Amino acid sequence: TVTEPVGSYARAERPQDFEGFVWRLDNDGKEALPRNFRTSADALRAPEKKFHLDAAYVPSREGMDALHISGSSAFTPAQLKNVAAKLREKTAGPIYDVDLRQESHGYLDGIPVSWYGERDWANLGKSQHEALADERHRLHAALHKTVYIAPLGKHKLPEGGEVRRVQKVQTEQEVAEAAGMRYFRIAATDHVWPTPENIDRFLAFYRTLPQDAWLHFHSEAGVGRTTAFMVMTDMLKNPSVSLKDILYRQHEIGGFYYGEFPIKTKDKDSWKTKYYREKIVMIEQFYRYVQENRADGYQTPWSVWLKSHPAKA
Amino acid sequence: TVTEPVGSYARAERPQDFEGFVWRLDNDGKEALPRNFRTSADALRAPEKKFHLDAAYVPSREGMDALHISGSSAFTPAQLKNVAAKLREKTAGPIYDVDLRQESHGYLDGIPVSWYGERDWANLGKSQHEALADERHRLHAALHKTVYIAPLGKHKLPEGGEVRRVQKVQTEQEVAEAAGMRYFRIAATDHVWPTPENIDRFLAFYRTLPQDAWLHFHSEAGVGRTTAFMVMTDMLKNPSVSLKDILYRQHEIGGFYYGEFPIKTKDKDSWKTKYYREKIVMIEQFYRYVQENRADGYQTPWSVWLKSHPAKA
Numbered sequence: 273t274v275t276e277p278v279g280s281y282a283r284a285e286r287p288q289d290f291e292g293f294v295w296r297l298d299n300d301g302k303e304a305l306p307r308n309f310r311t312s313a314d315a316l317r318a319p320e321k322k323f324h325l326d327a328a329y330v331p332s333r334e335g336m337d338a339l340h341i342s343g344s345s346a347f348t349p350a351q352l353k354n355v356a357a358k359l360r361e362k363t364a365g366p367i368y369d370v371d372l373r374q375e376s377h378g379y380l381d382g383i384p385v386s387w388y389g390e391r392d393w394a395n396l397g398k399s400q401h402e403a404l405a406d407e408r409h410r411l412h413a414a415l416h417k418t419v420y421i422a423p424l425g426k427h428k429l430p431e432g433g434e435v436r437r438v439q440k441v442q443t444e445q446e447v448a449e450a451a452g453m454r455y456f457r458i459a460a461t462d463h464v465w466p467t468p469e470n471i472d473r474f475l476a477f478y479r480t481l482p483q484d485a486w487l488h489f490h491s492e493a494g495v496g497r498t499t500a501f502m503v504m505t506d507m508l509k510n511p512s513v514s515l516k517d518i519l520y521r522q523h524e525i526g527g528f529y530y531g532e533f534p535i536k537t538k539d540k541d542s543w544k545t546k547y548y549r550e551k552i553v554m555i556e557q558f559y560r561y562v563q564e565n566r567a568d569g570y571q572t573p574w575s576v577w578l579k580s581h582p583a584k585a
Numbered sequence: 586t587v588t589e590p591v592g593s594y595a596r597a598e599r600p601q602d603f604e605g606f607v608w609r610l611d612n613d614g615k616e617a618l619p620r621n622f623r624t625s626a627d628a629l630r631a632p633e634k635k636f637h638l639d640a641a642y643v644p645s646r647e648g649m650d651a652l653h654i655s656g657s658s659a660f661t662p663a664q665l666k667n668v669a670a671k672l673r674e675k676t677a678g679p680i681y682d683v684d685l686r687q688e689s690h691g692y693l694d695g696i697p698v699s700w701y702g703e704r705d706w707a708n709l710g711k712s713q714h715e716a717l718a719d720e721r722h723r724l725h726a727a728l729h730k731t732v733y734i735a736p737l738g739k740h741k742l743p744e745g746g747e748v749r750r751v752q753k754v755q756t757e758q759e760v761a762e763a764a765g766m767r768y769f770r771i772a773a774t775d776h777v778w779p780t781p782e783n784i785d786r787f788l789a790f791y792r793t794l795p796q797d798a799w800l801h802f803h804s805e806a807g808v809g810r811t812t813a814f815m816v817m818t819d820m821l822k823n824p825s826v827s828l829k830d831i832l833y834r835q836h837e838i839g840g841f842y843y844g845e846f847p848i849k850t851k852d853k854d855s856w857k858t859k860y861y862r863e864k865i866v867m868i869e870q871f872y873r874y875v876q877e878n879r880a881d882g883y884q885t886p887w888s889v890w891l892k893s894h895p896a897k898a
């Protein structure tokens with residue numbers, strides 16, 4: 273009777289309506305660091321107004337000093353070494369660049385770009401294998417070819433930018449390993465809740481980690497996907513902390529807020545409304561997964577548990 | 586000794602530096618007519634101040650009534666039908682759409698676009714054969730594909746525009762024949778003086794026209810290349826008219842002035858300067874070709890004559 277369960281709404285959208293049409297500039301490389309850079313060691317600041325939170329609530333910091341995670345937006349290669357260098361002061365563990373982007377991206381002549389389709393959905397519906405093969409094929413195709421690279425402006429369309437003939441092409445994995453970071457890819461679709469596949473892959477990965485591993489999450493802006501995986505990591509590693517505290521603290525170090533709040537979008541942005549609501553419900557559902565399955569050591573994965581414990585809108 | 590004779594400066598430029606990167610919007614289709622629409626039967630207007638001409642000068646109209654030519658910018662299909670209907674009111678002869686554009690262009694869902702490279706030079710150096718081959722391959726490749734079409738804005742780079750999955754592809758040949766016009770293509774490079782190859786093709790074409798043929802020339806903006814062939818036609822068919830009159834009258838009906846004038850360029854447009862100067866010289870040289878070959882019936886092709894009678898800087 274149910275075509276798309278809650279948590280899988282994006283499956284109803286049609287990928288053929290969002291195919292990539294331009295190399296989008298992911299970071300202009302002007303600053304020393306990527307945007308929205310934050311670490312779990314950072315001091316808590318006031319909530320953003322739009323979330324209508326209790327400014328005076330002080331969330332527990334239980335486990336934060338030990339969390340060892342960070343988040344950021346996309347970066348140039350120089351910016352990533354600066355990140356790696358900053359993080360290397362805080363740990364002697366391996367540092368992972370955890371790349372949460374389903375969209376095909378890489379570096380053309382050291383410039384960080386992505387193949388941008390409407391809503392950033394150019395790889396919508398593809399398996400991780402298919403997404404990455406596309407990415408590799410496209411990047412290789414750009415070498416010694418003329419390309420147009422532009423930032424998005426008015427109404428999410430190209431505005432200015434530049435044209436060049438590319439002399440070097442790199443994957444983010446190459447750039448990460450050049451900055452001394454290990455690399456882990458989770459192909460998560462922009463704007464929406466990560467898929468069961470996304471999270472099963474993340475959970476098995478998390479399970480292989482040495483104790484002193486530091487996880488640096490990033491996506492395009494370092495907001496939606498980055499925060500979702502920061503929050504999930506926090507819940508997994510610190511299961512005795514309350515839902516509310518996890519969400520308050522991940523927001524107040526510079527993340528998105530993943531609890532209820534009054535959503536009011538502009539008209540041309542109202543397609544986002546139900547995707548926000550979906551993420552809120554799924555955040556609660558993941559919390560529940562952790563509480564019920566951590567005891568036995570996660571004998572049953574998220575994808576399976578969720579099919580027998582469907583979320584409700 | 587001499588690497589590139591006058592008339593062939595553009596041959597020294599390197600094609601690989603101007604390769605196409607975007608589907609440019611050739612006309613937004615808001616007006617009923619293309620821009621710079623004019624006919625050889627129009628009233629003369631005041632010259633443009635930037636050319637510092639004698640506004641009191643009354644050029645001879647000898648032969649203009651019989652000249653039967655027109656010019657305009659690029660157009661949508663509906664705009665072309667409007668052009669064809671207006672011209673049909675002036676003549677009962679065959680009406681020609683003379684397409685002077687070297688750049689690859691056509692129509693996607695009826696939208697006039699072109700494959701734009703910097704300086705509009707994406708087909709620089711190609712034979713007319715190779716250029717049309719590029720055009721056919723690109724137009725066809727766009728069918729059922731997602732494309733980005735954009736007007737150029739600041740600094741000749743894409744600004745805004747639209748994204749669509751293309752359901753229909755046509756050549757300008759198709760669009761012209763659909764509007765009741767005969768089609769003739771001369772692949773002339775934007776900004777520069779037409780090659781001897783271009784001019785030879787046009788002269789052989791001119792020599793096969795019925796007496797009542799009406800030539801509608803057009804290029805991207807209907808200024809540079811369009812005026813050059815309107816002027817050439819005026820000289821071939823009205824050989825007894827003075828260089829000065831021709832140039833004055835072709836400007837005063839709405840064309841470019843192809844005589845000497847104080848060139849005032851911007852900085853980012855100083856690359857233009859020598860190409861303007863080249864054209865003024867080659868215009869005079871063509872006139873000389875007309876005068877010296879009007880008598881033996883144009884036995885001698887422009888390209889061979891020009892090689893023995895090279896023009897000087």
Ligand SMILES: O=P(O)(O)O[C@@H]1[C@H](O)[C@H](O)[C@@H](OP(=O)(O)O)[C@H](OP(=O)(O)O)[C@H]1O
Pocket residue numbers: 392462463490491492493494495496497498544
């Ligand atoms: O790429 P990430 O790190 O997942 O972050 C998202 C990304 O920057 C999107 O482009 C953005 O959409 P908009 O440009 O439409 O804001 C979205 O904001 P929103 O969904 O909160 O608007 C972010 O959450």
Ligand SMILES: O=P(O)(O)O[C@@H]1[C@H](O)[C@H](O)[C@@H](OP(=O)(O)O)[C@H](OP(=O)(O)O)[C@H]1O
Pocket residue numbers: 705775776803804805806807808809810811854857
């Ligand atoms: O396509 P056509 O009819 O040959 O007309 C030319 C075309 O519009 C060029 O883009 C334009 O250069 P700009 O974009 O630099 O103006 C040039 O003007 P200019 O060479 O007089 O500047 C025109 O002559």
Ligand SMILES: [Cl-]
Pocket residue numbers: 571572573576
């Ligand atoms: Cl199971």
